[PDB]
Amino acid sequence: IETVPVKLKPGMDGPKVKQWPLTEEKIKALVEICTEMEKEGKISKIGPENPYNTPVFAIKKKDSTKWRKLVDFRELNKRTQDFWIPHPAGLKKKKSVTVLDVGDAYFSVPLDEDFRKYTAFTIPSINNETPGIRYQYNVLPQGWKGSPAIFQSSMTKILEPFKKQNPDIVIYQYMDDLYVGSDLEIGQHRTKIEELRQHLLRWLWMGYELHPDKWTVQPIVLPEKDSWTVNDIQKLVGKLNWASQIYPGIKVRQLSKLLRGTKALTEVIPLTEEAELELAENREILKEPVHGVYYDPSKDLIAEIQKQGQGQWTYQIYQEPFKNLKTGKYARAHTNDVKQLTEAVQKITTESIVIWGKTPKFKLPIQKETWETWWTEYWQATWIPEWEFVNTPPLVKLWYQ
Amino acid sequence: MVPISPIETVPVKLKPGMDGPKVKQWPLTEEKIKALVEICTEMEKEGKISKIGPENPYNTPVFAIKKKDSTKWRKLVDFRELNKRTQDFWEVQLGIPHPAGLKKKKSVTVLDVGDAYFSVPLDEDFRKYTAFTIPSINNETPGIRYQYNVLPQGWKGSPAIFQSSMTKILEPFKKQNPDIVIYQYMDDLYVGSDLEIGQHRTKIEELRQHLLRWGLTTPDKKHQKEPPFLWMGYELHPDKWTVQPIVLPEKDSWTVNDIQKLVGKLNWASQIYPGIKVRQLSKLLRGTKALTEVIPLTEEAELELAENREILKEPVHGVYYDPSKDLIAEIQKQGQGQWTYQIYQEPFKNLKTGKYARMRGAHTNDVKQLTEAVQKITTESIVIWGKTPKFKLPIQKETWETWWTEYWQATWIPEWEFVNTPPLVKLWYQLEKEPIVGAETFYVDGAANRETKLGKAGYVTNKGRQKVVPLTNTTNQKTELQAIYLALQDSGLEVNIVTDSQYALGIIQAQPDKSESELVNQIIEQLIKKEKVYLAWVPAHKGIGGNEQVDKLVSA
């Protein structure tokens, strides 16, 4: 019922981010949402003496039809004084993990009055017909990195009756989300989390289901054929040459030896027994892990995505080139690439939160202007990661195909 | 005394660590000093300013300038220093409303609320920093000390605080008159409705009564300006809008400054005038920023400017927006990376027009450019009308399907239909996904000596065909492209090409149909002529068959 001192980082002012255009239906949804928040004291109108701004938009959360307000606090999050949540390494090892939205608990906690000015946002008007409707927050805002930090004191006390009733459950908080993991059978997992809901009720309706996949890093696979054409062997040598940047003893000499001469690409080449031995030794090398692959919490996570076609997307997460920490494949709108990419980004970010407790920086196979025009139309999560754009087609797409 | 309502005060601060201004009052003539004393005395009895004493250490210079054609001095308080040290505000007018976004309305009335700028109180704690001195005659007595009680003309915060005050005043009137729209712009209130003129003027009279609650006087019916409204460079008529007359400069010795000023004027005209072209006029400003030198022009720039002066000959107008009709956007390819579009709801009655020029770059194609134009028109339409328009595009549905399913990037355009208006956007070649059976296989390679810039480009094939060409004034990248060009030149309609150039593959896999490199353009022209091309890549210096044979041929 009392506020906590919160400041910015030294030598930095509050955010001054431009509001981007919004459709009429999103503007009206935000007008209704913010009108009720104002009556409930959560936000208040502000005057021209507040020069700060943070973008706002509207989403329809997964499996729902009512609009939700999402504030892009990425710039304020970069500029807010850090608050010092040891990420549980056991969460990634649990059989199932459920994501519970608990963001509404923040609105019952007041925000430091001196800091409120920095949370300012603007509901834009169509065609600049009026100046925007300007608001600032009075309570902890959803999406601000300081909200889980400040509420962590209170959140710990709510969960302790549950955590000691179930020492086997792992609970982790990131932003507005609670991640709840156990090793139980799925039926007994649904029930115990419906039990966990009996706390925000006393002291919110939906949940997300997650299961770790077989491999943290998918193995590099080589074809198994009975007849190899010149083209097949050229593609194999290229993939082995690329993998030799990752794996130590990959040899291609005996396989390149088969390509001796100036042969048609479709001519069948019998493999010699030395070449078949080299290929066989390469297979065994590729089934070992990569040497010297460790997570450093001080360094950023990088995620690259490749469009493979037919709704298939490959990705790799790393900190150092050729030292992949995780790789994967996202599959299955059969007509909208951008919607697919936006869902892959959210799925990769959720996996990154579970494993390392932070979001990666994306390298997106898309032009900036196309992505910035459309990604908000399909976004469904309350956090937003960072991203950059790839404008030159990487040769690497083949090697994960 | 009918009690007038007070206007809320906006809290104002100076910038952090900064303090108020202290600028010397410059020597003024006795003629000017007498004029400033009379002006400030009437303002004092009006409550706008008040005398202060020597306790206030801040000062802002005051000047006197004669209003031209008038024998009347006017006061000017140079707030340029206090502005540098006043806090930042949420500023006025993030963007400019576009006339095409106005909804069709029966009547619109303008009220002049200029009498209200000096009827808004200034923050009491901030008045100290608006101090100024009227120097005495012959400088023999202390100067007359004054401070402001209202928003001063020229102070940094006056525009924003004035509009925020009007917005609060106007809020209960808008809510209790939902059928009334009001747009404020400086000292003007544009009040519109769809009421018949009798009920409209009644509502206007109620607004005038509502403004008097705060002691705000407005012009009565006889003194209100009439359509057309001249506003932000537009002419607004009851049913049509256009731009204000675009006047060009007519010199035969051009400079870089005025060519900067007229490209912005041709761009200004392009929002309603169709076919405005500025490409050849804009490529004269290439990296030369001295604003006082001359340069003639080409046989195609005056051909595009012969009509630019001739397009502005007959006035064209846009219409206003009917939210009950569909919003349609149609795009045409103009050639040379230029694109034009029209936004309309009924045929041949445009809401507005515009153009799009391709982004700078080495290689491009028409589908990417059309995609970019679509995204630009989408964002612009969200701003102006709050919705994405339906698109009519000069590209076949099958062409677009083939493009986005095979393109290595994710891409998307919103709901659209094909319109058969040549020239059509098309894919000019499509590489194969598998090697071609029966087609000759060309192993190409190029290499260049970095010092002498001498190099070689060549191929060997599975049928024993070979070529090596020596090159001067070339690089490794150029020899690798030249090698591919040779194979394309010397093969049949179907051909497999094996290269080790990651550079060449990265260019070709981006699917350009036009390039600023004439070598890439010649490759593109060859690709257009072929029926099937399969392009394979192998790593260099690994003894790959054919590739190792041609490698020793071109690096010698």
Ligand SMILES: COc1ccc(C(C)=O)cc1CSc1nnc(C)n1Cc1ccccc1
């Ligand atoms: C400068 O004029 C502006 C500018 C902006 C606005 C906004 C954003 O509402 C209104 C106006 C008032 S004009 C206006 N407002 N709506 C329409 C239609 N019009 C055009 C018109 C002109 C004269 C008579 C009748 C209709």
Ligand SMILES: [Mn+2]
């Ligand atoms: Mn080469």
Ligand SMILES: [Mn+2]
């Ligand atoms: Mn070579």
